[PDB]
Design a protein around this ligand. Structure first.
Ligand SMILES: CCCCCCCCCCCCCCCC(=O)O
Ligand SMILES: CCCCCCCCCCCCCCCC(=O)O
Lengths: 13, 215, 217, 13
């Protein structure tokens, strides 16, 4: 997954 | 360059500015992984890579990128490290907790050398951007692009060292030749972290735990 | 420079050009043989022999693994999907994978051999990079780290003047050469860990000089 | 000791 890293990278706002 | 301005790399650095010392270090690493993603996003062209390639570069580099930061943060103190949490770890605490060896390698191979040459934040930023743009990182969709980004960063760094330190013709060489030490220290810190995880009895927070997960 | 001539560093590389089925046995055998040659190479590097005996021991103990890996990697630029040992034996990728050492072998091919091949790294450049590895001012126990530091500085000033003179169209060539040293360090460390396991488990002949290098500092 | 390495380095031959 690498859930957290994916969520932080995607997040722009 | 205009492709890879040293201004933007400096702006990225400035934008992010339990007795057990190992617990405190692990807690600080977890917090700084959140900041590290925001730092990478401010490095020119990083965010234009595919999400998969961004993940691969941050997973390969996070350890060296954090060690480079706390080492440069610690040039103000004698025989200790300053964590991003504002906590200080003295050499004597590190030795007392069974991580004297690696702590001394950090002090001798990185902190003291950064201190000796007075490495500035533009130079640290560039060296961190070179570590980030690691064309050897396994599974990259396009190693060539990462290679050219690394090349743009080291062209930018060299023009910066020639412009700012014209009297030190060896300075560029000297900066690049801390990267092997940083790699070796990175690998030894990783082995410590895997042991801490394996044995338990050191709390490891979710983001640091994720970085230690073996796909 | 006059204090660290690139001619002498090339002469050291030219001076050491050479004349079972487990690839791991074959590689360990070649490593023992090349440790003998490595001492002779070090002695031909300007100023190395003027260091104290203790400091010479420290630098060759700290560097031998990297120094041998640089040499066989550069020897292997002409080989498809394999390495050429100093013994004249070839090790193909398929054998390495079949012997349980595929990952590290692929790292050697991908991070070192293919990159040396891509930039066509010459023997003067290899000699310099090996002399930089040798003059490791971070090596523990050095009587005078400062003088090792200045020898490293003389080598990288000599390398950079050589790359500017010979490859004036490749402004980044110097940087590119120095930026194979982190990979060499990383690969070095993983090879060492392999060697210690081969020793621990037995079932690999390990000759006297390689055995000695694996005996604790 | 580093017996071999010492013998090889000392030798000037
Ligand atoms: C420094 C030597 C301690 C040895 C313990 C191993 C811990 C792994 C090191 C990972 C980097 C820590 C990140 C700290 C974050 C910061 O404050 O900038
Ligand atoms: C070559 C990498 C794959 C094998 C992994 C085992 C680790 C062996 C250690 C490397 C020593 C290098 C010896 C080279 C000798 C030569 O030049 O022929």
């Amino acid at each position: 997954k690498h859930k957290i890293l994916h969520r932080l990278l995607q997040d722009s706002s | 360059s205009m492709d890879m301005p040293v201004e933007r790399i400096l702006e990225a650095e400035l934008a992010v500015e339990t007795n057990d010392p190992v617990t405190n270090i692990c807690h600080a690493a977890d917090k700084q992984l959140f900041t590290l993603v925001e730092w990478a996003k401010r490095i020119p062209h990083f965010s234009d890579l595919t999400l998969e390639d961004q993940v691969i570069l941050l997973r390969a580099g996070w350890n060296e990128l954090l060690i480079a930061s706390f080492s440069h943060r610690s040039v103000s103190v004698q025989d200790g490290i300053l964590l991003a949490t504002g906590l200080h770890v003295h050499r004597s605490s590190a030795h007392s907790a069974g991580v004297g060896s690696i702590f001394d390698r950090v002090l001798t191979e990185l902190v003291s050398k950064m201190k000796d040459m007075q490495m500035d934040k533009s130079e640290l930023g560039c060296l961190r951007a070179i570590v980030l743009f690691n064309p050897d990182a396994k599974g990259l969709s396009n190693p060539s692009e990462v290679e050219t980004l690394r090349e743009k960063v080291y062209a930018t760094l060299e023009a910066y060292t020639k412009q700012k330190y014209p009297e030190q013709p060896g300075r560029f060489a000297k900066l690049l030749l801390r990267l092997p030490a940083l790699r070796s220290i990175g690998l030894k810190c990783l082995e410590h972290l895997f042991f801490f995880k394996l044995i338990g009895d050191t709390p490891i927070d979710t983001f640091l735990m994720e970085m230690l997960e073996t796909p």
